[PDB]
Design a protein around this ligand. Structure first.
Ligand code: ZN
Ligand code: ZN
Ligand code: ZN
Ligand code: ZN
Ligand code: ZN
Ligand code: ZN
Ligand code: ZN
Ligand code: ZN
Lengths: 347, 347, 347, 347
């Protein structure tokens, strides 16, 4: 079968012809119908996930097939698979754990000490077929097709968990930084569908500010034309927001938005490539604010985003379909910031 | 009556002879039997609480009587007081709110937008009598005497809340920084009485390391004679601790202990005078750690520490009693780090 | 001023001409613009709240002015009122506590040991003016008028809290019993605005089933034309629902709906006049289900429903306005089940 | 190997000579060093778990080897086992799930839709060796020996979870019914080690009342010599207790103890063989009490009880060791209420 893989850090991804794996036990072989491509793949091409080296830190022995945003049809099942049949269309949760470590035992499998992350340190969906280590990491698709579901396994689950980490309720206000981008509009949609909180979206280009409003933001701010902090203080009557979801954590956002927090406010950091946070510790104590990290999501987060999406309560991302052979090009587009919409490869 | 007050920032506290207030409505007049003195008073003498100026930022019109650690006997009650009688011995919660703002409505009265903090921006216990704005902020003492109870209204409630913010359970491990000091041993005692968590205490002098062990720490580390990070990694089998209660937040502690955190670990900051936190944002995201502030406590925190102390489940601080006239001297002792034990003034 | 009051249990409510109270301290005098009338008043006329006798059990000394659903304009304020002015239009939270008891200290003021419930054991809004014991129990109205806001102080807060007690999230399904009635459609609206959960509504008349659907239910069941349990098992794929909000707790509902619960399901009981629950204890243990009571709401619940309503996130109840003199008639209508929509008196 | 099994409901357990299983994949073969026997086995001999028939309702095809309280040494491991070696002494969590259903995905594996309960519907420890389906369900023993650890996998985990369901904190009081029995003293010990709550223990014989006190109860009541309700009202100053852990749920306990609950009190039911609960629904609503079931425990509960026990924070049950051949006799002892201490079989 065809597979686009990282063969050498410093070279582009390479198309190889390799054998189709045979699933055993609880494994499932999926015939890929959609392989999402996101900014994380710009770094995977460089052999990094966050600051982590996939070879040195995650134990990867190259080559590895990329593609952590997976949906497709069941091709074959191992003899211990229960509850699924050949032909079923499913989305896959790639953030898998092994079961024995502390994090797995308490239900936070994505923080597993020996992770099994498909498309990151295990072979992924940039191929005609892909092995899912255990059938429990799937979700049958009824309303969505593969292209609509694939991006949700990464962007959907990530923002779903970040909204949960924001600990919202109707008495509160949420600020989403970069609310008009793909990730930002997904966060706005989820917050509007699940919390009852007042949602403020901020961005810097007019199109983006409009997309945030289309996504459901109650208030939107164009940081290029208005002082964001002053607008936030006006909207919240000087209280500040009870949570910020910062999808960037750049020198730029970290130097402004933490100032928008209300007492006990939660600053949820979702970016994997940003700056250092510099903040006066005594002010964190006096205001009881919290700086909290959020990474992808666990099985419960996966079930939640899939259930929302399958019920039509949040809408799929804007996508552009491409061929498996254009994988390098898709990643190039993200590097050069020329990508419009979420790119999805169709093998 | 006699009252020691801040009359001019830059001068020592001044003893004045002023009228005894007459309580009305829900107010209670207390005849002071114990007025605790803590490091916060070294700053109050300078007109500051944390980085806040009590005049500019809190609205104080000097002079103001200090003393936020209060216990004594009820002298007189206003006509709306219910459930207490003249002669009752009580401890007082000084971190009072007004009721209408967001924080009061959700039960976090200490974060009130227009706080009524006795001994800080309202007259306190460095006097023969003190007015308690509402009787609901008291707790009748049965087992403890005033001197034993007074420090708990500040140090006890502060560490009780910090232990709550650490979100401990038996599957977890807590690290208390500065575990041998007065605040540190109180935190160790509370954690041992209320969480079931494994408790690691760290300090830098041999006496302190021993006091932490007496307080109940399961493991204690002398940071002067051992590498604290290596010991923590050994004790936790490389996982790191699920929470750190840092009672200092100095350049010193902030540069070491956040490294001891396990994934999803909570770094609880309780210090009001420290440095800046500098931490790589992407590492907060990848590990899902949290930096969280904790300040004094709310009514529920007050009820909890008082209930634990009145049941003998935690022990009173080591104290040294002094006269109301020695207030300046007591504060001098804390400035010069010559104070042994918690100083308590007896009018 | 005119006031309609309970003067003798066994007689209809009596119109009296009494003095206008003068507010002092934190009290506020409100000029009533809307006084909601609900089924609770059918029982108040009989001197009962639930099975409680307001005289014997709550300490009421007759006569008492009814009306616990209050909105109006500030007429006068006591000298300690802050943050409100004469002329402000506000809704009032009538479920007030005194501050000192356990329940008040932990922020559950409605469960106060010595409650101050306006319209129940304290004079209410069936009069030209009404005293609010403390200004913190109000909410300024901007988007809603008094008639739209008044019912929310009882029906809105009650269902808002019941939805919270149901502990919903997007992975779950909620069943609302009696989903087409005034209370039922309010519960459906709140659940749809704040949880992300799949919502099933059940009722027994065609109009009601339609109103539940208009309210936002994802699935609605006509219990008269379909087997509710079989439909629930079909919709939930045999799992059952994760929560039921039972607004009646009649012999009828209690004998059917607890059977619809999934393992760990929460059966939230909101009715004040129902039957006995009879359930095999071993089945509660084996399935980990929970039977949980929910009564009116606390300050946080009041803030939440008011914020949702003021943001247009839930819609006001269908109302019918009437004169203060028609109070007895309004209650008669509820007794005879002839009331259409929520009746609101306008003094 | 020797194995004592249920071969026919209506006959005593039968000793058979069967093959030793060979573990594959993540399975582990354990050489049994301790097989606890509890009241649940009196019912297993009758083919029942609670009211469930293990054949009709759980799908068991007889014969099945009993023994759900397991500790022993690793004999052999399948090729996917990581983190354990031959010879390691471990306790096993028998309440296993399959991974795909709702309950498994949210971390409540014991409520799995297709449970794998060792000693109940899967072969257990009443044999020389036993297969553990996945290595993640074990805990290495360092401080405890097999006989001390085995009972904890059932009684320890059950009471640990019930204490968690009681939602205790230092501001609250817990009542443990039957506090002097094996299960009762374990509940008292756990509550004392993990909550900070005031603990009241009640029982009916003098020895039992004393054992409850030895276990750590702050207050103990002899229901045979004192009115339990009056004593509870005295101790709690008329408030009632915030939680009751009822280990029986008999007509007897259910008719008395729910009356001891304070408003918002949680009545935690742990018994598998009791009566029907009959309670006036309007009183549940008015007081916001909760009746909540608790069954065995999940992976997080297992980790917690094992960590407490391995740290010496709770003590092992009083045990009496016996031979595998005396299994029927051990169960007879429990039937005739002649068993003193927890019986543990040693193959
Ligand atoms: Zn992605
Ligand atoms: Zn793991
Ligand atoms: Zn202090
Ligand atoms: Zn306030
Ligand atoms: Zn009402
Ligand atoms: Zn109260
Ligand atoms: Zn057992
Ligand atoms: Zn399962």
């Amino acid at each position: 079968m065809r597979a686009v893989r990282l063969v050498e850090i410093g070279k582009p991804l390479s198309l190889q012809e390799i054998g189709v794996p045979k699933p055993k036990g609880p494994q499932v072989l999926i015939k890929v119908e959609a392989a999402g491509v996101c900014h994380s793949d710009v770094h995977m091409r460089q052999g990094r996930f966050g600051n982590l080296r996939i070879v040195e830190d995650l134990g990867v022995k190259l080559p590895v097939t990329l593609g952590h945003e997976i949906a497709g049809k069941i091709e074959e099942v191992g003899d211990e698979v229960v509850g699924y049949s050949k032909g079923d269309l499913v989305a896959v949760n790639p953030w898998q754990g092994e079961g024995n470590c502390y994090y797995c035992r308490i239900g936070e499998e994505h923080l597993c000490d020996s992770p099994r992350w498909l498309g990151i340190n295990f072979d992924g969906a940039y191929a005609e077929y892909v092995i899912v280590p255990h059938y429990k990491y799937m979700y049958k698709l009824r309303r969505l097709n593969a292209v609509e579901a694939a991006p949700l396994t990464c962007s959907g689950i990530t923002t779903y968990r970040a909204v949960r980490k924001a600990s919202l309720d109707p008495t509160k206000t949420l600020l989403v930084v970069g609310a008009g981008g793909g990730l930002g509009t997904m966060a706005v949609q989820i917050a509007k569908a699940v919390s009852g909180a007042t949602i403020i979206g901020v961005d810097v280009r007019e199109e983006a500010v409009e997309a945030a409003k289309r996504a459901g933001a109650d208030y939107v701010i164009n940081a290029s034309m208005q002082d964001p902090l002053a607008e936030i203080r006006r909207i919240t009557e000087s209280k500040g927001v009870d949570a910020v979801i910062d999808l960037n954590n750049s020198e730029k956002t970290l130097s402004v938005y933490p100032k928008a927090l209300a007492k006990q406010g939660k600053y949820v950091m979702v970016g994997l490539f940003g700056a250092d946070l510099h903040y006066h510790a005594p002010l964190i104590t006096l205001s009881e604010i919290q700086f909290v990290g959020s990474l992808v999501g666990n099985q419960s987060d996966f079930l939640g985003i899939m259930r929302l999406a399958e019920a039509g309560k949040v809408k799929p991302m804007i996508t552009k379909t491409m061929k498996l052979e254009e994988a390098n090009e898709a990643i190039d587009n993200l590097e050069n910031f020329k990508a419009i919409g979420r790119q999805v490869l169709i093998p």
